[model samples]
Target: YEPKSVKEIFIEMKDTVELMVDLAYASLLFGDKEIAEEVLELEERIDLLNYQLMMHSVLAARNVKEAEQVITILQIANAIEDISNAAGDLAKMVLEGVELHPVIKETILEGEEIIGKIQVYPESVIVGKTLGELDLATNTGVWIIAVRRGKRWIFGPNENFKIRAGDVLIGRGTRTSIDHLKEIARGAIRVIG
Candidate 1:
């Protein structure tokens, strides 16, 4: 019903919303305000992207059949948006310094994929390097789903993404990949666990 150009964008956010929920609870368990705050901030991006999808879908519809087809997609979009809102509520508790139960904190760690953020450093070797240039997926088995540089959150970044100091990469991968990613982000030698 709509141009598929940005369909991948909305799809990425669908997974990302769930990731943020896990991260919010993880942050709450450890009382890490920075991660929790980042989760809250990223949810707004989801809201906007979903709205864009809705408008695009409606305008691009050609007939009742096509329009009806998009109805299902729009429903899923709303569902995904609900996830973002739910994550926001969970994260807001942490931001407000609300004490949470220990069992709930531990449950967030049970997700299939682990989500983390890596902050770029000024002298880091990866500084100014693009995602593809680093061979991120092939070499590291990691996915850089979002990059927040200053005020911009670039979602579903491809190989063309370039890094910079103060950029925060929201990623999902194995523990090994996470270690490698942090090493790259910090310009440090990888530490074995």
Candidate 2:
């Protein structure tokens, strides 16, 4: 089997897990079964990635110092796996129709952190601009996690990634920023100078 570096595998695992958590929360907030299913799919991917990272870590250790470092990596990987499972469990609750306390949603609404999904329409102001140009986090206080273009997903999209028509941005932010982002996407408000 072709091998990946421990760090490479870890980065992907981290991103995928982050997406899973966001999707899980979104599913709960909207009671969307499709989003919950996506979380489970990502959970399966994280399980395989955990195995790959373990194998690479075991083989990469060449000496005592390296071995010690490898142990820490393993510990971190274990924690990442734990988080993926927790996100998966959250999704499962949505899938199985386990009713949540209404307060849970109210808390999420009133909480500081929120996950949002918005599509870039062709006529939207942000289309054709790179994320760096928009500096969305600074201007709107939303940090985009990924973008879904048609059937493909761009995980951990960087600043250089350009916003295109029909690109679905998944971001994390506060309530005001989420509302602002949606309004901008719908062309209700223009970007401020």
Candidate 3:
């Protein structure tokens, strides 16, 4: 086997692990058993990659004192693998037709809110059910930035943008405002803690 840079190997491992997470989430949402199984297989690949990298790092360390830096890379790889595993677990629950418990649902909802808020940028807006209904309280005081349809990115979305089921949206606003905006977007009645 050709000797590869630890950084290069780690990068590939990290990306693969992240893809596993995405696949797991998709499996859960689409109720696809195949996707869940694929995720498990991908996780096994990640384990193999981790082991290979660790062994290489150990060998390299004997020749170069700086090789210890690879330990940080290993740490990151482990974290990514853990995330992938968590997604797989969620997929398992979905495959079993188990409805998310209320507490789990609330946590997921909270995560959605946080994600919405984090992705907000300057001059960004929120678009969804409440926006379509012209509900003031549920309206986030932001403007729609763009809409993603398949591979195309549509800029300057109109009032009749007509958001589809899987459309990706880009919104921008102040961090604090976006946090508030997420609440309105999700119709969250009260802020939990």
Candidate 4:
């Protein structure tokens, strides 16, 4: 098993994902096809690295009876990939000169804000809390449209569906409601150190 801390691995993965988003934004702002292509290539690289880290995490946890932790990590990895892919899709649209609907732009911004504030929680705590928050938000009329579970995509999860640590939820609702939901879901009280 790898000796590197799981937290360290998670930080690197988060940074990579953030970098991809930045590249995508730059590509859009500058109308640069090269930058857009670079975003796509970087996303692919991130995906591979994510997979490797997940495997390492799983192996490391297996010996310690933390296979469930491995599963949570994998879920988080998938969520990160989904967000990266969404950025890539935007980059592609920009490169192709396809206009992004205003709603889409708003949704992406909301997503960025939510993702930016995610505090590091223990894999188990995050799995429960995040999903619980989403469920609560949904009850208030928000819709969690998709969840990125590593390589697999879950669309419209049921009420009982549990979210793992790394899962990224793509939620939708009226703009005001969505923004409000984000605020509630990511309030300081829920923040992890």
Candidate 5:
């Protein structure tokens, strides 16, 4: 248990799966052993979240109407789990130290988003502020996909969630946006995207 709504947790897990998959394959393609291991670790973590979603969906159902709602959540959780499961597979290949095909790297950027890691430093303006206060998407153009706080991960952290120093933001954006995000994480004012 995290101190968040069950729905919020599911959202986080969903977003985290996508980023983890993307990063896992990217790391494999680049032959980065360390990052690939990181993905592998996150897979086990995400798997638990899926189970928790199921439990929440079941326990929170108080009526037929509520059951219908949670049924939809189950469907969503199933879909997300499948995607996350695939990501685990991809990450496993890399964790095994197996050689990846060259095409993996070449085609990874077929999408528009670039998945990367950034830190929340003490000097950063966003350190003690919530995402809404920072106006991250509009001002920075950087959409945070997930956040790593110690061993805990907050997926799709909503705008109301505050960031803390030592937290690692796993995000996606354009090249310029990523650069600006890195700069802000390094103590620059949260000015550019």
Candidate 6:
């Protein structure tokens, strides 16, 4: 089997961590149980990725000098894993119905970016249309981060990804843009260029 390079694995770890943090906070801000579950899903995924990273680091080092470099890499990977674990903890609070402090809301709201999720209905105009055709980012200023279809998830979907009925789309954008996205999902807004 062809093994992945350290750079490639580390880059994927960073991307996954970014999504995990976004979903964790989104679950709190939106009070969405499904979004919180998605965070845990990512937590499991990052754990596996971290394992692979460690395995590669352990096997690639041959000399003392090489081992020293591997130590630095492991430390970086450990920090990334720790962040994922903390994000998972935030998700667990939502899953377990823990009461969050008011200041938490204030801190989360201080950011310009917000996360939201909405399900596509059969009659929604975007249904059967590709993301590129909808041009959501240009029209509504929100980027679709993930789509949940029952127990399955499509993360970081591209332009070719099509909207389907019952697909729960998780997005990142300003509050106004997310509201517009909700409207679109509900079929309140029909015309799209």
How many steric overlaps are in each model, in order? 0, 0, 5, 4, 2, 0
- Residue clash pairs of candidate 1: none
lDDT of 6: 0.85
Candidates sorted by TM-score, best first: 2, 6, 5, 1, 3, 4
Write the residue-wise lDDT of candidate 1 on 96-168 in tens digits.
Answer: 8877777665554444555567888887777877877886667667667567788765765777888888998
- Superposed model 6: Cα runs more than 4 Å off: 101-110, 118-126, 131-141, 148-160, 165-168, 176-193
- What is every candidate's alpha-carbon RMSD to the true fold? 5.4, 3.5, 10.6, 14.2, 5.7, 3.8
lDDT of candidate model 1 versus the reference: 0.73
lDDT by candidate, in order shown: 0.73, 0.84, 0.56, 0.61, 0.75, 0.85
- Candidate 6 TM-score, true structure as reference: 0.72
Task: Give the per-residue lDDT of model 6 (tens digit) for 49-95.
Answer: 99999999999999999999999999999999999999999999899
TM-score of each: 0.60, 0.79, 0.49, 0.47, 0.61, 0.72
Ranking by lDDT: 6, 2, 5, 1, 4, 3
- lDDT for 36 in candidate 2 is 83
Report the lDDT of model 3 for residue 179: 61
Q: Which predicted model would earn the best lDDT?
A: 6
Positional deviation of residue 66's Cα in model 6 after best superposition, in angstroms: 3.2
Q: What's the residue-level lDDT of 142 in candidate 3?
A: 41
lDDT of 2 by residue, 4-58 (tens): 7778899999989987887788778767677788889898999899998889888
Where does model 5 exceed 4 Å of error? 1-4, 115-171, 175-193
Query: For model 5, how does the per-residue alpha-carbon lDDT over 1-193 read when each residue is reduced to its tens digit?
Result: 5455787878778767877876675566556665566677777778888888877788899999999988998888788878877877787787787766776665654446666678878888778888878777787888776677997866657878899999988776776778788888988655644
State in Å the error of residue 74, model 4: 1.4
Worst 10 residues of 1 by lDDT: 105-114
Task: Give stretches of model 3 more than 4 Å off.
Answer: 100-193
